[PDB]
Design a protein around this motif. Structure first.
Motif, short mmCIF file in Angstrom:
data_model
loop_
_atom_site.label_atom_id
_atom_site.label_comp_id
_atom_site.label_asym_id
_atom_site.label_seq_id
_atom_site.Cartn_x
_atom_site.Cartn_y
_atom_site.Cartn_z
N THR A 45 5.64 -6.19 8.56
CA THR A 45 4.41 -5.49 8.89
C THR A 45 3.59 -6.28 9.92
O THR A 45 3.06 -5.71 10.87
N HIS A 53 -10.91 -6.11 -0.78
CA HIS A 53 -10.09 -5.66 0.33
C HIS A 53 -9.99 -6.73 1.41
O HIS A 53 -8.90 -7.03 1.91
N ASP A 75 4.06 -4.46 2.33
CA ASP A 75 2.77 -4.05 2.91
C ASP A 75 2.70 -2.60 3.42
O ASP A 75 2.46 -1.69 2.63
N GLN A 102 1.41 4.31 2.56
CA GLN A 102 1.78 4.03 3.94
C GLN A 102 3.27 4.24 4.24
O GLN A 102 3.64 4.47 5.39
N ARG A 153 -14.43 -8.43 5.43
CA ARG A 153 -15.08 -7.35 6.17
C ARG A 153 -15.67 -6.29 5.23
O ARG A 153 -16.76 -5.76 5.47
N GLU A 202 -5.87 -11.79 9.08
CA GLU A 202 -4.72 -11.09 9.65
C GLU A 202 -4.82 -10.94 11.18
O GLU A 202 -3.83 -11.12 11.89
N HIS A 214 -7.12 -9.53 1.55
CA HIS A 214 -6.61 -9.64 2.92
C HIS A 214 -7.48 -10.65 3.64
O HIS A 214 -8.70 -10.57 3.55
N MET A 234 -3.75 5.46 10.54
CA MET A 234 -3.53 5.34 9.10
C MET A 234 -4.67 6.07 8.35
O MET A 234 -4.42 6.79 7.39
N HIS A 287 0.87 -1.19 0.00
CA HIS A 287 0.00 0.00 0.00
C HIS A 287 0.90 1.24 0.00
O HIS A 287 1.35 1.69 1.06
N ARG A 318 -4.78 1.53 12.77
CA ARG A 318 -5.59 1.81 11.58
C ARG A 318 -6.27 3.17 11.66
O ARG A 318 -6.41 3.86 10.64
N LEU A 332 2.58 -4.76 13.42
CA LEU A 332 1.18 -4.61 13.81
C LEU A 332 0.69 -5.59 14.89
O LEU A 332 -0.49 -5.56 15.26
N1 LIG Z 1 -2.04 -4.34 7.70
C1 LIG Z 1 -3.27 -4.25 7.42
N2 LIG Z 1 -3.74 -3.09 6.65
C2 LIG Z 1 -5.12 -3.01 6.13
C3 LIG Z 1 -6.15 -2.73 7.24
C4 LIG Z 1 -7.43 -3.58 7.09
O1 LIG Z 1 -7.33 -4.80 6.80
O2 LIG Z 1 -8.53 -3.02 7.31
C5 LIG Z 1 -5.19 -1.91 5.06
O3 LIG Z 1 -4.19 -1.21 4.78
O4 LIG Z 1 -6.27 -1.71 4.47
#
Ligand SMILES: N=CN[C@@H](CC(=O)O)C(=O)O
Ligand SMILES: [Zn+2]
Length: 449
Positions: free
Chosen positions: A292, A204, A318, A59, A207, A233, A230, A83, A56, A80, A296
């Motif tokens: 990462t 993504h 990541d 980041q 979720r 995780e 993803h 972020m 990403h 998050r 995290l």
């Molecule tokens: N290291 C995880 N990062 C994910 C967070 C997520 O899965 O919502 C993200 O950048 O979207």
């Protein structure tokens, strides 16, 4: 033509290998035990370049800045929030500058191609840009500027949680319905093709999208493309999935979707033995992002069990707190060691050398996940490679797989000296021609943020 005293070829290490490379950057001829005959004599051991199967880009701008305790139980989830606040301020121009700088640093580390898991789509208010592909196009242009291979993965993101929860305000720049998403893939075909870049399908997470959306996208005819997601995780995702479906994330995916070799399952950290077995059986690639996942507090993947069952994996940087092939592979192995309290965990029945086991695995899984003709020096594959330091006392005194062990377990990034992508030298003696200009633009962006 180029010439290497030592090179790691598909069948193993070789000597005095002369490589002929076509105008289109493809390996045309590979001859071991050959004469240099005018070819460019390389300065050290030659390896296939490492694909980076998960990124990403934006980041990198906040890398290391989230290391400030604000709670006795800071977590992935408080990270998050931080972020989200970061991505809320990023302009298209800032995003491109960050990406270019990042890809340059990636190249210097030995990453020759990247899969950009790209979910920042819209303007600051969540409204679409005049050209909806605005930010995807800027990523492609950044990859071109740096010269790194690129599989662009525009990300479908629609919800805040399982069961199609309404997206939160912090997520507004990511959100598309399925139709808009499919239109984005369509818009991206021409420019990506012109650039020589690749495309992939991407959800993504479980979720962020619904099962019905997954079905829509997979039925849309892009049957040749990688599919990335993803998954598993964080324990919280596992718990929320159970409460939603009575299944774990990986368990649910495999029950409901025809997961196969096209798929890259990013992290997959919380996989029970049944889920590990299903993954290995499927031929899907586990996208492991060790630095990462450690940063995290995600946890440790069951790599030994996965590998024993024929599992395929690759590495991604990541969140980009680390940009180091060495660090990802070294700590993949070290994590298994710390858990088991034993040494020498990741090896094959036919390969007791740990460094070679890790490098072989990550090259293959990474090439598979990007959907690019890379990951090995064979005729017909793209000329992506790195040259290690031939003057380094540890590497010079070593031979074959011992050399990989010295680099990956006793050495570091600075042993990577020269880097070629599609037949073009993009790093020479540790230097990238664009580094000066990029750093200048980058430091300005950091100040603005
Ligand atoms: N290291 C995880 N990062 C994910 C967070 C997520 O899965 O919502 C993200 O950048 O979207
Ligand atoms: Zn990610």
């Amino acid at each position: 033509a180029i010439f290497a005293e030592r090179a790691l070829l598909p069948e193993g290490w070789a000597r005095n290998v002369r490589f002929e490379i076509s105008a289109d950057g493809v390996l045309a001829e590979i001859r071991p035990d050959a004469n240099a005959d005018g070819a460019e004599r390389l300065g050290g051991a030659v390896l296939p370049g490492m694909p980076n199967l998960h990124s990403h880009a934006f980041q990198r701008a906040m890398a290391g800045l989230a290391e400030v305790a604000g709670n006795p139980n800071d977590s992935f989830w408080t990270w998050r929030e931080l972020m989200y606040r970061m991505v809320a301020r990023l302009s298209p121009e800032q995003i491109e500058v960050i990406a270019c700088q990042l890809y340059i640093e990636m190249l210097k580390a030995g990453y020759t191609a990247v899969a950009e898991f790209h979910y920042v789509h819209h303007d600051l208010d969540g409204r679409s840009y005049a050209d909806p592909a605005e930010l995807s196009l800027r990523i492609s242009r950044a990859a071109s500027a740096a010269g790194i291979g690129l599989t662009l993965l525009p990300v479908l993101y629609s919800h805040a949680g399982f069961g199609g929860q309404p997206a939160s305000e912090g997520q507004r720049r990511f959100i598309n319905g399925s139709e808009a998403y499919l239109e984005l893939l369509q818009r991206l075909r021409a420019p990506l093709e012109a650039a020589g870049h690749s495309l992939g399908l991407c959800f993504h997470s479980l979720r962020a999208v619904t099962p019905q959306q997954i079905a829509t996208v997979l039925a849309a005819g892009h049957d040749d493309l990688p599919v990335h997601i993803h998954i598993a995780e964080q324990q919280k995702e596992v718990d929320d999935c159970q409460a939603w479906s009575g299944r774990r994330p990986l368990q649910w995916l495999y029950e409901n979707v025809a997961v196969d070799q096209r798929w890259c399952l990013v992290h997959a950290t919380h996989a029970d033995p049944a889920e590990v077995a299903a993954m290995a059986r499927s031929g899907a690639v586990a996208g492991l992002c060790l630095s990462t996942e450690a940063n995290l507090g995600d946890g440790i993947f069951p790599a030994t069990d996965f590998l024993a069952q024929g599992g395929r994996l690759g590495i991604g940087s990541d969140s980009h707190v680390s940009l180091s092939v060495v660090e990802e592979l070294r700590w993949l192995e070290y994590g298994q060691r710390l858990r088991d309290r034993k040494r020498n965990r990741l090896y094959r029945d036919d390969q007791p050398m740990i460094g070679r086991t890790l490098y072989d695995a990550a090259l293959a899984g990474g090439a598979q996940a990007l959907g690019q003709p890379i990951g090995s020096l064979a005729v017909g594959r793209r000329a992506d490679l790195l040259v290690l330091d031939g003057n380094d006392p540890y590497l010079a005194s070593a031979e074959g797989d011992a050399l990989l062990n010295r680099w990956l377990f006793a050495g570091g990034d600075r042993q990577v000296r020269d880097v070629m992508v599609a037949g073009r030298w993009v790093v020479r003696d540790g230097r990238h021609a664009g580094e000066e200009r990029s750093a200048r633009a980058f430091v300005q962006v950091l100040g603005e943020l």
